[PDB]
């Protein structure tokens, strides 16, 4: 299908909350080779965040039901196998997105604004794999996640205003990576707090068009600061 | 797998809110041929209710965008997406109706089981009626009404007015009259009569169905106020 209709179908599937179709539409747009605008980038990220989000919540539920009430019995082996099924779907979604980023998006990225956004997604979906991995490849997925975050973080400080929602969003997920994956809560708080204060100090760079997108992510940073401090 | 592991897995999928996995497990339990207990029967209902609900809500959004947003090819893509959701909607209802008329209703012995399963049959024929059209529509509407009427006659004779299965049937039967038959007066009397008959015998209500009967009677009141104003 033409790109224009694929975008029309993607926004249609987002209204109907059929996110699997929305991801398939944005995966089809990406694989055609044309660069993605800011709207199309957000459609792709929102589509796959919902797809992998349903698997992450299900994995959390099953893992908690596994450990709690984990008195060893034949009922436990079925819980483990059902967890592995969700892990397999979760790994398949993360593998698909990372192949899109490495083959099409990050490769054909033009402006540094697109490069920061795509490198943030790469750090996001390696982070999701790190939540579900063990042993050697967990150490590898963590380094893959941190490497993409760090390069995006260094480019955003050089090329983006601190109030830019992509730089703010990257700092939000980079701090979550420190708190949940690295188990370094103090560094996670400083990373989120530094971005929040630098954005507050440049609040005048926002305007009637950009105020809402930035201040909501700044509120998300503050919500994690309160949570990780309480 | 045996039924024991299927019920266990179906409750895991329910906790994980993976209702497609939950529906296949209860479908596997049903097609083993044995009569479902009250717990398993409600697991089957909750599973397919969520499976069909996602397509029913998605169908409503696509249909409204098609209505309020009418310009060419931009409109054809919308309807082609609507019929795709319609195909899934029809596939789900057909599976539920075949489970009913091959196993569930087949092994239905007591009135409570018949009223429960005949209500499901009317519900999923109604979900088809919301989407069907033409000569295929009149038969689905009749099949829906035919299932509701038999369950309505059995429940009125064999069930207490405060029983949640009898009250839930009257809730959906009245909804059938309002939204499918376009008859609000009969829909109101349907819901009002079942509500008043439940008020008149509140001392017959045991505390077990307190939670269900109180909610369903509130649901009857919500439709009554909405349909009168």
Tell if the CB–CB gap between A13 and B54 is shorter than 8 Å. Answer: no
Q: Choose the mutation target among A3, A6, A16, A19 for the interface with B, i.e. most B CBs under 10 Å.
A: A16
Residues with Cβ within 8 Å of residue A204, at least 6 apart in sequence: none
Is the distance from CB of A98 to CB of A126 less than 8 angstroms? yes
Q: Which two tokens stand for residue B58?
A: 């998605």
**Burial profile A77-86: b = 16 or more Cβ within 10 angstroms, e = fewer:** ebbeebbebb
Cβ contact, residue pair A13, B81, below 8 Å: yes
Neighbours of A206 (CB within 10 A): 19
Chain A residue numbers with beta carbons less than 8 Å from the beta carbon of B64 are none
The residue assigned the tokens 């929602």 is A165
Radius of gyration of chain A, Cα coordinates, nearest whole angstrom = 19
Determine if residue A135 is left, alpha or beta; phi over 0 gives left, psi from -120 to 50 gives alpha, anything else beta.
left
DSSP per-residue codes, chain A: --HHHHHHHHHHHHHTT-HHHHHHHHHHHHTT-PPP-HHHHHHHHHHHHHHHHHHHHHHHHHHHHHHTT---SHHHHHHHHHHHHHHHHHHHHHHHHHHHIIIIITTT--SHHHHHHHHHHHHHHHHHHHHH--THHHHHHHHHHHHHHHHHHHHHHHHS-TT-HHHHHHHHHHHHIIIIIS--HHHHHHHHHHHHHHHHHTGGG--TTTHHHHHHHHHHHHHHHHHHH-
Angstrom distance (rounded) from CA A97 to CA A91: 10
Place of tokens 């044309």: A34
Q: Do B57 and A8 touch (CB under 8 A)?
A: no
Interchain pair B61, A16: CB under 8 A: yes
Task: Report the SS3 class of residue B161.
Answer: coil
Residue keyed to tokens 């819980």: A79
Whether the CB-CB separation of B151 and B122 falls below 8 Å is answered with yes
Domain boundaries of chain A, sorted by first residue: 1-230
Residues of B with CB under 8 A from a CB of A: 5, 8-9, 12-13, 15-18, 54, 57-58, 61-62, 65, 73-74, 77-78, 81, 85
B121 contacts: CB under 8 Å, gap ≥ 6? B97, B100, B101, B105, B143, B144, B147
Resolution (A): 2.6
Give the tokens for residue B39. 């717990």
What is the biggest distance separating any 2 CA atoms in chain B, rounded to whole angstroms?
Answer: 62
Residue in chain A nearest B21 by alpha carbon:
A82
DSSP state, residue B178: H
Contact B24, B50 (CB under 8 A): no
Contact predicate A149/A177, CB 8 Å: yes
Copy the structure tokens of residue A197.
């204060």
Rounded distance between C-alpha atoms, residue A170 and residue A16, angstroms: 28
- Class of residue B185 by CB neighbours under 10 A (exposed 0-12, middle 13-18, buried 19+): exposed
Q: In terms of CATH architecture, what is A1-230? A: Up-down Bundle (1.20)
Residue B71: strand, helix, or coil:
coil
Nearest partner of B96 among B65, B60, B149, B55, judged by Cα: B55
Method: X-ray
Does B12 sit within 8 Å of A65, measured CB to CB?
Answer: yes
Residues from A in contact with B at Cβ < 8 Å: 5, 8-9, 12-13, 15-18, 54, 57-58, 61-62, 65, 75, 78-79, 82, 86
Residues of B in contact with A5 (CB under 8 A): 73, 77
Superfamily grouping for domain B1-229: 14-3-3 domain (1.20.190.20)
Q: Name the DSSP class of B207.
A: G
Question: What is the rounded CA–CA span in Å between residue B191 and residue B186?
Answer: 9
Tell if the CB–CB gap between A82 and B13 is shorter than 8 Å: yes
Q: Whole-angstrom Cα distance, residue A117 to residue A134?
A: 28
Nearest CA in chain A to B61: A16
Asked if B12 lies within 8 A of A75 by C-beta distance, the reply is no
DSSP class of residue B226?
A: H
């Amino acid at each position: 299908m033409e790109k224009t209709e694929l975008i029309q179908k993607a926004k249609l599937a987002e209204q109907a909350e059929r996110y699997d179709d929305m991801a398939t539409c944005m995966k089809a747009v990406t694989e055609q080779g044309a660069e993605l605008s800011n709207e199309e980038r957000n459609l792709l990220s929102v589509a796959y965040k919902n797809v992998v989000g349903g698997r992450r919540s299900a994995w959390r539920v099953i893992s908690s039901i596994e450990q709690k009430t984990d008195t060893s019995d034949k009922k436990l082996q079925l819980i483990k196998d059902y967890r592995e099924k969700v892990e397999s779907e979760l790994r398949s979604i993360c593998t698909t997105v990372l192949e899109l980023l490495d083959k099409y998006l990050i490769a054909n990225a033009t402006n540094p604004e697109s490069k920061v956004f795509y490198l943030k997604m790469k750090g996001d979906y390696f982070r999701y794999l790190a939540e579900v991995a063990c042993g050697d490849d967990r150490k590898q997925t963590i380094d893959n996640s941190q490497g993409a975050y760090q390069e995006a973080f260094d480019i955003s400080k050089k090329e983006m205003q601190p109030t830019h929602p992509i730089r703010l969003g990257l700092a939000l997920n980079f701090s979550v990576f420190y708190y949940e994956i690295l188990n370094n809560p103090e560094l996670a708080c400083t990373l989120a707090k530094t971005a929040f204060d630098e954005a507050i100090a440049e609040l005048d760079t926002l305007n009637e068009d950009s105020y809402k997108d930035s201040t909501l992510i700044m509120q998300l940073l503050r919500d994690n600061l309160t949570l990780w401090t309480s």
